[PDB]
Design a protein around this ligand. Structure first.
Ligand code: 3C0
Ligand code: HG
Ligand code: HG
Ligand code: HG
Length: 384
């Protein structure tokens, strides 16, 4: 049997690789926040706790589950089985309520801007996270570890490992409704109000100008400099015709409004001088003209202040990675209520692993898309 042996070797290598990636990715996130004060924001306190739960899944949950399935039975005894099940459900429950914290915290920043942001400190973020881990422990740990003593008998036979009060299929489904389906519904409606609040005009023109200015700096060919120069110049004219939040509410004839438009008139003059050199053949000099643009922009940035579009996109990615990876297991629980043979044990293992995969791809939802995390990752990996 040369094939059944290769499947075991393939599974061990794939499981060990996923566990290793989950460990490294989440440690890099947690260490980056600790060593860089620029990453010590309220949002990253919630991501630190999220990466903290993902690290426990990669270290304990993934490895103990791989040993369980490869050997074919539970070899570590009943005590370690209860501790593993309790740790798995508490850490998972803390993740779900962590996503609820991120969703509600973002909801009150767009619906209560005159009240909530001033109440949004790292001490409040630490208390909400601490309360989430305490509530998760109280909900799952005593029931998983001590239900056998309440009923007075341990029905989990030797070599088996499962939650004892889940012997009733309807009980498992009620758990799926309260611990997964209801939270996902809440996070979906919360995001629906987030994207509708994002869907005012001054932030859209200034963000387009700054984003296309970076594209010129890191452009590989001549098509990326032409598209960025035109789309930025279009956004610069729409940002010039509008009035910024100026002090004292000054008329268009004021020296503040005249010099504000004059700052954009200098920028368009340098943009067309960069567009010229890009067509003369000095595409490298047009990229050197972007530094002159960044100087003029910085010389007249005192009239303006938004990365909130990226923040909303980041939350959606974190929520979708949670829904997509945890949905297959929960529909198996639903089908299990009326047809247990409809879900083979191989399908159960796959659905259980997909939930673990949520911890693997979670850092890639935000860390590999944020400019500050990338710079800190490079610094953590270079040899001093
Ligand atoms: C570690 N898991 C893979 C186990 C199986 C799944 O369980 C669930 O999806 C249920 C809701 O049906 C759930 C339990 C606790 C917290 C959140 C969800 C995902 C997580 C959770 O700890 C268990
Ligand atoms: Hg941790
Ligand atoms: Hg933790
Ligand atoms: Hg992702």
């Amino acid at each position: 049997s040369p094939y059944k042996t290769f499947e075991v070797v393939f599974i061990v290598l794939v499981a060990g690789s996923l566990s290793l990636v989950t460990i490294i990715g989440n440690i890099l996130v947690m260490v980056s926040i600790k060593v860089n004060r620029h990453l010590q924001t309220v949002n990253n306190y919630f991501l630190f706790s999220l990466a903290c739960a993902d690290l426990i899944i990669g270290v304990f949950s993934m490895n103990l589950y791989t040993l369980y399935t490869v050997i074919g039975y539970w070899p570590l005894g009943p005590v370690v089985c209860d501790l593993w099940l309790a740790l798995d459900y508490v850490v998972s429950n803390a993740r779900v309520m962590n996503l609820l914290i991120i969703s509600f915290d973002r909801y009150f920043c767009v619906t209560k801007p005159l009240t909530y942001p001033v109440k949004r400190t790292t001490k409040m973020a630490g208390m909400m996270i601490a309360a989430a881990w305490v509530l998760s422990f109280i909900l799952w740990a005593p029931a998983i570890l001590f239900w056998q003593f309440i009923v007075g008998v341990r029905t989990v036979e030797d070599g088996e490992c499962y939650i004892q009060f889940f012997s009733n299929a309807a009980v498992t489904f009620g758990t799926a409704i309260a611990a997964f389906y209801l939270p996902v519904i809440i996070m979906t409606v919360l995001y629906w109000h987030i994207s509708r609040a994002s869907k005012a005009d001054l932030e859209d023109n200034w963000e387009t100008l700054n984003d296309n200015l970076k594209v010129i700096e890191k452009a590989d060919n001549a098509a990326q400099v032409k598209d960025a120069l035109t789309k930025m110049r279009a956004a610069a004219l729409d940002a010039q015709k509008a009035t910024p939040p100026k002090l004292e509410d000054k008329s268009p004839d004021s020296p503040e409004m005249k010099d504000f438009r004059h700052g954009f008139d200098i920028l368009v003059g340098q943009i067309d001088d960069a567009l010229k050199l890009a067509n003369e053949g000095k595409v490298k000099e047009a990229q050197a003209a972007a530094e002159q643009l960044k100087t003029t922009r910085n010389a007249y940035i005192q009239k303006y202040l938004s990365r909130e579009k990226k923040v909303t996109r980041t939350i959606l990615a974190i929520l979708l990675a949670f829904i997509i990876t945890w949905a297959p297991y929960n529909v198996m629980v639903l089908i299990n209520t009326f047809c247990a043979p409809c879900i083979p044990n191989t399908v159960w293992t796959i659905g259980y692993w997909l939930c673990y995969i949520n911890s693997t791809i979670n850092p890639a939802c935000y860390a590999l898309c944020n400019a500050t995390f990338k710079k800190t990752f490079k610094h953590l990996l270079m040899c001093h």
